[PDB]
Amino acid sequence: PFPYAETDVADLQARMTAGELDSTTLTQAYLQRIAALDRTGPRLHAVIELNPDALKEAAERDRERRDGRLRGPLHGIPLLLKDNINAAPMATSAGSLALQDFRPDDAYLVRRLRDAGAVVLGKTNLSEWMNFRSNNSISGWSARGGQTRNPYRPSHSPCGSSSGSAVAVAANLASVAIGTETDGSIVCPAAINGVVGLKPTVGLVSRDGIIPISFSQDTPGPMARSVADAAAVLTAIAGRDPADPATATMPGRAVYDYTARLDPQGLRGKRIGLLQVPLLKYRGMPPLIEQAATELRRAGAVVVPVELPNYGAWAEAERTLLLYEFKAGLERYFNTHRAPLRSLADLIAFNQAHSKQELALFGQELLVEADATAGLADPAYIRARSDARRLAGPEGIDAALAAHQLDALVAPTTGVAWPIRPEGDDFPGESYSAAAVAGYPSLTVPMGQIDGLPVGLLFMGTAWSEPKLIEMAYAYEQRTRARRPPHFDT
Incomplete structure (x- = not known):
């Protein structure tokens, strides 16, 4: 029995405050569990690099605690970071062999977490290049990290690109983790691995020191087994950064x-739109989404059916803006952090020179x-960026919210995990693209399982509505508690 399985940040903090636990002992517990599950047993491959300073940091936090000098709710709490997020002295590789020895200084949000007292356990694996390398890619695979596996059923996909962070949290390999989302990359793997994922409004949390795809859409966000844990993390990382x-x-x-x-009364008097989208009829979904609506009402919310007409009509425009923004953003990042690659051409050339190790399963x-x-400066880009944002936000989420005077929209996040195959992902559908493309906050909470595989309930709101989305998500979670631990089905 893992003694800290399913234990919240508040409870870990209480145990530490009482003296029954400390950061060094807790960190040792996670390290030993990582050793037992990550590259042997079920071979989750969630952790791409351990922090050589994890235990040094844990010991510092415990020494501070013994002097009665706490940093707040995250003091001594071990967490994992997606490996597109800069954190010394680890590499920040995006899963690529090209960056296996690239060890830039802490990202803004990492500086914040460390000042808050969190212990960085290490970095988590991700779909290589945040899943922007190939349309034939396999979610959760990278050359440097291998294949991350879903702990509910290790033959099946963890989704991604924040694959290792979702898996690690779900399998109790750390207390909490950080992911990043461009479109789906937090909330998809969170839902798929039965955990909470929160993608904030773009701008709530600094993107400094993160290997980027999109200036318009990218954001880091917390991944955790519970809403309370996710909220504690968001408190620590939210803030203005002149960078x-x-x-x-x-x-x-x-x-x-x-x-x-x-x-727990956070849903009383709230108005929620149940989105009329294809995932409502995904095989096995109707009983779950029906039960979720019912639980929302039992918590005191009004729940009404709502359309977001032409859901996904921003797809073409979004693809265009992402291609343009990826080149420009990556090249700026490489320059800023003095990376050993300086251009996308360099990366492409590296991959061809390392084709056996980088391009064996799929291309680039x-x-x-x-x-x-x-x-x-291409007007095609300018139009695409403007169009995608307008369709998804003002004309999408905002129009739906306004027309029915709603506080939030909800939908199933995605379908269930699919078999890991050389052919690449068999993707079931999504309801998270609108929020990602709008730059608006979304939050997935476990709402049950189909065939033993987790599914999530996605909440979405207008810009800067995180406080209200968190209240509503929490109130939902506390009366349902639909998360179950993974048990590594074969």
């Missing part, structure tokens, strides 16, 4: 503790396509 102009665009930026929004067609883009 990231997107964080200057937040109106009424105020010091805010999101754990104050953990109200999307890298090539992005590299072909003329740059950010």
Whole structure:
């Protein structure tokens, strides 16, 4: 029995405050569990690199605690970081062999987490290049990290690209983790691995020190077994950073503790739109989404059916903006952090020179396509960026919210995990693209399982609605508690 299985941040903090546990002992527990499950047994491959300073940091936090000098709710809490997020002295590789020895200084959000007292356990594997390398890619695979596996059923996909962070949290390999989303990359693997994932409004959390895809859509976000844990993490990482102009665009930026929004009455009087989307009829879904609507109502919410007409009509425009933004953003990142690659051409050339190890399972067609883009002054890009955002936000989520005076929209996040195959992902559908493309907050909470595989309930709101989304998600979670632990089905 793993003694800290399913234990919240608040409870770990309580055990430490009482002296029954400390950071060093807790960190040792996770390290030993990683040793037992990650590259042997079920071979989850969630962790791409351990932090050589993890135990040094744990010991520092415990020494501080013994002097009665705490940093807050995350003091001594071990967590994992997706390996597109800079954190010394580890590499930040995006899963690529080209960056296996590239060890840039801490990302802004990592500096914040460390000052908050969190212990960085290590980095987690991801779909190589945040799944922007090929349309034939296999989710959760990278050359440097191998194949991340779903702990519910290790033959099946963890989704991604925040694959290792989702898996690690679900399998109790750390307390909490950080992921990043461009479109789906937090909430998809969170849902698929039966955990909570929160993708904030773009700009709430700094993107500085993260290997980027999209200035318009990218955001880091917390991944955790519970909403309370996710809220604690968000409190620590939210804030303005002059390095990231997107964080200057937040109106009424105020010091805010999101754990104050953990109200079991948080759904009373709320109005929720149940999105009329194809995933409602996904095989096995109707009983779950029906039960979820019912539980929302039992918690005191009003739940009404709502359309988001032409859901996905931004797809073409989004693909275009991502290609352009990936080239421009990556090349800027490589320059800023003095990486050993400086261009997308360099990366493409590296991969061909290392084809046996990098290109054996699938190609790099999307890298090539992005590299072909003329740059950010192309009016085609400008129009695509503007169109995608307008369709998904003002004309999508906002129009639906306004027309029915709603606080949030909900839908099943995605379908269930699919077999890991050389052919690449057999993707079932999504309801998270609107929020990702709008740059608006979304949050997935476990709502049950189909055939023993987790499914999530996705909440979405307008820009800067995280406090309210968190209240509503928490109130839902507390009366359902639909997460079950994985048990590594064969």
